[model samples]
Target: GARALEALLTVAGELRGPPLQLDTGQLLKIAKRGGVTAVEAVHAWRNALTGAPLNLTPEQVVAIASHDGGKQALETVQRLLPVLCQAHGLTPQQVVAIASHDGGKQALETVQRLLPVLCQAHGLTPEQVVAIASHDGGKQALETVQALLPVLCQAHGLTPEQVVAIASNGGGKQALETVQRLLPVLCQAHGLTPQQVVAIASNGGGKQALETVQRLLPVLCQAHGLTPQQVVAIASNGGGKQALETVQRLLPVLCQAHGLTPQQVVAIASNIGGKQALETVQRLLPVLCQAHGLTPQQVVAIASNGGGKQALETVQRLLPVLCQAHGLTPQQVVAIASHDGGKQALETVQRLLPVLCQAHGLTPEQVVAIASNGGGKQALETVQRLLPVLCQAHGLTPEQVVAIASHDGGKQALETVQRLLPVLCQAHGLTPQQVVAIASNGGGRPALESIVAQLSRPDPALAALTNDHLVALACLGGRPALDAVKKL
Candidate 1:
């Protein structure tokens, strides 16, 4: 009776509420498992007596839970983690990661590290944060975080611009690196418009306007002294027609793959031409750029629009010469330009253009014009002859003249031919018939075709064909010489 009274008094003094019927062995068992100490058990019991609310550290709870609940509680945590993550502002995957941690404090610490990234991801605002906090408290805080991804993405380090790029770029580690590399060029050096940056970054630089600027930047900058932004502005000035066409060839790959851009594709296209152009652009697409959401056909359309009919035709005709001059294929040029390495090549070409022209006795403008004229071999020879006269007038050495001509031959020999041939024929008083004769034969096919045409004419001078020319000319003996006609 005395012992029972003592136990009752003990229970009543500590726990004004009814005593829980757990055995003393429960505390002992938990303590043995490192969940609680004897002193902690005593303090808990005392608290129970006073009807105090439960207060336990997360670590202590984990320890107790480990002892009492074992794997069951761990499994429960695993199940609850998604809900917690949703509430606490985290991805389900992130929540699982945290729950897999040994303790809540560890999870919370990890969340701290991930917060900035997540905030950037979700564009979470302070107002949203408050609302979520008020509604769900901290129970499943991660969910609240996840809910705000788009907002946070706009707000955080990556920025809305970067976020869009990542999305279009397919959110890979490599694509993120590319975005980082491209940022300074866009933000600082080029002063890209916010719209363009967003478009390029999100679309992986495949938007028609963005792509044109990116592919042309180095040349436009180094050659024309235009920044990438300036290039964009210029392309914009072109009424979007030229800009869209310039990038048409790249859109498909960029949209379909990560890190893919119009610039890289243009580089690849630079390496390929003629039958190769058909093959590269059409057949075995050596598509290296990451295309996520575009198609090759779309890229083709962009190129068509940017170049326009005339420019595209010009490129098609002169591409062989251009590629050969640069010691590159169209595809290779496209590749080199798309990557950072392309900067040097572009700069080198731009700087060299004036020098090359001077050395070869012409200007870049002249070169372009001549190239457009279908000059061929005779034109190149004409330039070679004129270069010495021009260079001598410039007070340079005959040796220098030779050097320039040599360099021109080595580099742009074909381009020179294409440019100067027609000019030479026109200047030298040759007709198209004569020009064709020079091209088709050792000036033989033109002679034959002309002779045939002339003979076919009804005029007496021409109508006689073989009979009148040789014998009649011999009998008449009036024209310059029979040797001249034979030469023709």
Candidate 2:
């Protein structure tokens, strides 16, 4: 041990770069494990890197010595160092991070072959290439990235960064391949945007989530009136694969028990802690109604409002408190708690309700009526802005406008009327009374305006139908009948 140490110290003293300082214990340990030959290999590797920008540490030397083919691995690593640095600009630490793996020579060759393809062909930065090289099955990951990049980028509209993000996770190679195969189905058949598709794949259960979405999205959409976006929302949760699976299993049960739609179920399942949210609702919903004396509709309103787990939980705890404190009936509580901002609105209703009524000139009855249609805070804000204007500017009574605006989509109706009513009367040759009467039914303004716009688009015979005839066609039964009449 002493003679080997003397030789190692004498060799280290000849190095031109960082000092080599190995304690007696470390030197003895290396010498005992692989003998003086292994100690010489460690010193030789250190000497080779002396003038280079890399530093070799005693710990790394010990690790190299402990390997079965430590001497040959050191020589291979030293030979490949300049090439890796020149090609990928890898730091010494990064080079070690890869070459320290088992089968270091083959792994270095794999990294060398893949660096250019990943960096030049796929437009990944050296850092990203290094990141891929550092992971297990890294060679496979780069190969997968090379094969999948063009398809994901061009066809799916994913950025390189997003693809990298997906490939950086566990099962990266499988994840990329899964997305490549399913992107078209998600985009064309399910109507998912590329962004939404990427979201599903980027979440942990990439392949499972994609398959679950395919089988369940159409079913959920048709059975529950859920948009593809809503289904994507459900599938993008952290436990997304399981969330989709649970939804598939429990959807029918939920619908049968509570008369829920897929849209409503999606809302429950897409929030933070989504899997827990779905389970909570499934377990507690019946309990809340049958055991706790809440009504079925109240339970549906609470669960279906898109608030997810938090809203369901908050309503269970605070529904009666809100009603008793504000003198709200069960119906009013249901109405308020059934909107997107239901949790926030209900939690602060003691303050928010009074302000809307007293300061905003709305009555509690008006607020409750507006909320009953699933408007929540946004509905209240829309009514606050447009209710007075429809009454004063258009000369419609408050009741007339509110009646039109208080249907299932009252907030959207009010928003549409605010923008389209004047144009329909002034530009479409329709009477103001006729416009009001048509718009009083939710969605009537856009329908009437759209038909009028279509009629005015210079079809010679249709244009010659006369303004009165067009108005009559429009008012006969709105745009559907008007389009049919025009077609005839």
Candidate 3:
């Protein structure tokens, strides 16, 4: 005991800065946490305080003492912090954040050794390099990002941001590597966009999705006349690789036996809930069309709703019930099934249709019309509540507001008009009527793009373009603002 006390005292006395302020009890507790003997803990404290070139703060000292290999790790961090700080233009705190993560000292050492190599090879910013190193298994993870970046960006057309998005997900470095290997095959061989490639990979089945695409893309394209976008649409969801594979096998049954069109095949295949949704659609599309006498187009309309796989399944179960028990017509079912959230609407309408129609004075037809606008059940509900308010506030006729609501974009278009139309009207010297006209039928987006394009173009008469002419230009070009009209 005396020897132990003497050892600790020697530990405190060796400090160059503030006295080793931790008590004997604290040292013993920290010693246990660090899995070191009392002498080793105090020795770590001493080295951290006096031997470290960087003045070890009390917090850092405690942290060092609490970790395994605290003495050696502290020495490593102190030695490496300055070199990394100057080399990468990182501040002391940023270096500390990396050096202080779990397994941080080892991570820092790897980064310190590899930073120069990675920077030279990859053109990575110091900040980006630091982010990779700060993640788990710094050395391996850094290598993965470096190896994948060139393939993902150069070969697959992924932006640096996209690569980071894919690499930094729950799968981390492994996911990045998987995507890098698969992306070129998916993009070059199968003709999917980098956006589509990243979408499928980032959803958790990076390699499997690619393999599915390799197996299924050609079959889907040739047999079903599905485009690459359509195939990607089907395969980009979670569990999408298997979904794509399953749907490809079922295509002939769906088309030849069930009398489905290629477009209808695309609709059922593109269900975001993946294979199960596609399966549900395949099983029920025939039932709804053949048994219930709904057309294939009508069935596709219902199945493709944003209700996803489960929603399509719900529609299958509920379609007949609503028609038989609730007295909903086939046309009403078609209207309800067309929106993104059609499944939710089906449930809501089953319970609330009578009340919404009787109390709110919204006809079932009006509800159906609202649901078909593609915003899903919530959009339908929101538009019903907001439509009259918007019409009255903006001096909009019912038809004008309805035109805005009926477009696939939903009630937000109406709200966007209310918020932004006035601004555009004043700034661009257009009337509110003109703004309303542009916003109707999703015209405002393209019109705004054209207005921005016309205003931003480099010419003597750029400012002189009228809102009407600019709206036409935007409508015609339909590209984003700056690039839309500049080449002219």
Window of ten residues with lowest summed lDDT in model 2: 11-20
lDDT per model vs. reference: 0.37, 0.68, 0.64
Estimate TM-scores for all models. 0.22, 0.45, 0.57
What is the per-residue lDDT of model 2 for residues 63-113, given as tens digits with 9 covering 90 to 100?
555444556556767788777877668877777766554444555667888
Q: Which candidate tops TM-score?
A: 3
For candidate 2, the per-residue lDDT at 372 reads 56
Query: Per-residue lDDT for 37 in model 3?
Result: 46
In model 2, the clashing pairs are 224-262
Expressed as tens digits, the lDDT of each residue in 1-488 for candidate 1 is 34433443454333333343334444333344423332233335433322323332333333433333223323344345444555555453343333332243333343444445545655644233322222111223443244433443443345543442333221222233444445456656666654555544333223343445556666655653334543443344212324334334334644354333445444333221211232234332223222222244432432222222222333334335546674444543332233222233333343444554667645544333222222222333544555555444334343333332332122243233334435534543434333322222222322333433333343454444453343344223322333355444
Error of 1 at 14 (Å): 56
Model 2 CA deviation exceeding 4 Å by range: 1-208, 211-242, 245-276, 282-292, 339-341, 344-365, 427-429, 442-445, 448-452, 455-488
Q: Is candidate 2 or candidate 3 better by lDDT?
A: 2
Deviation from native of the Cα of residue 97 in model 3, angstroms? 20
